[PDB]
Symmetry: C2
Subunit: 254 residues, 2 copies
């Protein structure tokens, strides 16, 4: 009863009309295939160029891209998860992920807690709030962004609040096979949840993104996967760690 | 500069002279191969029979097996990690793991925090202390027992205190491939540490143990592995998650 899509593509740095036109095209193709939600990659709208987003992308330009993405969700009739800089000035915003429903209503907004490397840490403010968890489509959805999912604590924070399906815009480059190969399957099994991971692919902003977008089910197995080329992955989704964990002790030992 | 051994074998329920004679034999063979430490499986001395340990194994019998195991470490000249019931009466003790050095000195004792299933929870008291971390052989070692390693929080507790090599007596049955296949490699990569896992194998106490004893290095790869038959595995051991994790937030979100 739930069919999701993941958009894997290459963005052009600082060209939102080009990158959002790719998202519009993917949303229309996902909807034609009966997908009910489209997940898109981290910072796709402006490309994964942290220092140049900080230097050249204004709050007004981010708000115009956000309005365009709400319009795509409404006009293509499909829920949409995107990732842009946050709405504040360039010196105060983070990296965010948002979910709009097929009506264009923004159901949830999350600010990336675990920034990756010095360029992100200079260009963005880290989030301070736990991942949101909300009902959509018959299950509890949640959002995280790229490096967050590599911390078991961030996925456990979502699953502790009831998450069953964690959606992760990503921008993973450098042939980092261990993230989708080793960490994502453990995040699924150690919580009993499904995770969807939508990456860039190909050369962008001086990096070569890995592609490898994937949906991993609760037994850690891929339900669908892409390679290194652009694509639109469409997947039909079908003792106990969460109860047994001694959280009152663990919280004191981190 | 560090060579370790793991003993994978079948125990006989409630027959410590038989099971400790197997450990003595493995310790002598490990030492002949220049191993400096031998890791043995969970509750091997009495077999993995929780309800019968609670019903029939006295504090005196546990203390005699402990004295025998300290003697093996000394007399075979090899550090030894074993796992017995704890030293208290049958209604107050837990499942423990201990490390003795090659002099027979007990360096560390740990009580299993995460008991597995209702039979363990009736037969044993859970530990309340974090895993120990200590220098041995040129690195920081730590101890956990079976189900503990399946909680990222338990391995992160050890790595937060400096652990580099986590030694895990186990008793994993039922063809639970996801533990060594999916979870152990993530525990290694998400902390940057090595883990050694020594299981029973074959039918014992009405269960069929999986074998699959393994040492996994920090990239999640097996450095050595056994299948389903008894054996003695001998292995020569050769952005940053531990610093970057926002532990002050994670501790509030578990």
């Amino acid at each position: 009863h739930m069919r999701i899509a993941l958009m894997q593509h290459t963005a052009r740095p600082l060209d939102p009309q080009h990158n959002l036109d790719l998202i519009d095209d993917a949303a229309a193709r996902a909807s034609e295939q009966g997908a009910q939600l489209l997940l898109t990659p981290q910072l796709f709208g402006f490309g994964y160029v942290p220092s140049q987003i900080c230097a050249q992308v204004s709050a007004e330009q981010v708000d115009a891209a956000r309005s365009r993405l709400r319009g795509i969700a409404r006009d293509r009739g499909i829920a949409l998860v995107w990732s842009l800089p946050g709405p504040e000035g360039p010196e105060q915003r983070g990296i965010t992920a948002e979910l709009a429903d097929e009506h264009g209503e923004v159901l949830a907004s999350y600010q990336k807690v675990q920034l990756y490397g010095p360029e992100e840490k200079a260009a963005f403010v880290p989030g301070e709030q736990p991942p949101p968890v909300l009902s959509w489509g018959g299950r509890q959805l949640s959002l995280l962004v790229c490096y967050d999912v590599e911390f078991p604590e961030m996925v456990r924070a979502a699953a502790a609040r009831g998450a069953q399906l964690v959606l992760v815009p990503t921008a993973l480059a450098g042939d980092e096979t261990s993230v989708p190969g080793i960490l994502l399957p453990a995040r699924a099994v150690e919580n009993g949840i499904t995770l969807a991971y939508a990456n860039h692919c190909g050369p962008e902003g001086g990096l070569v993104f890995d592609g490898g977008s994937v949906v991993v089910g609760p037994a850690g197995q891929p339900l669908g996967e892409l390679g290194v080329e652009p694509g639109l992955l469409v997947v039909d989704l079908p003792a106990d760690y969460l109860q047994d964990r001694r959280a009152e002790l663990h919280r004191n030992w981190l």
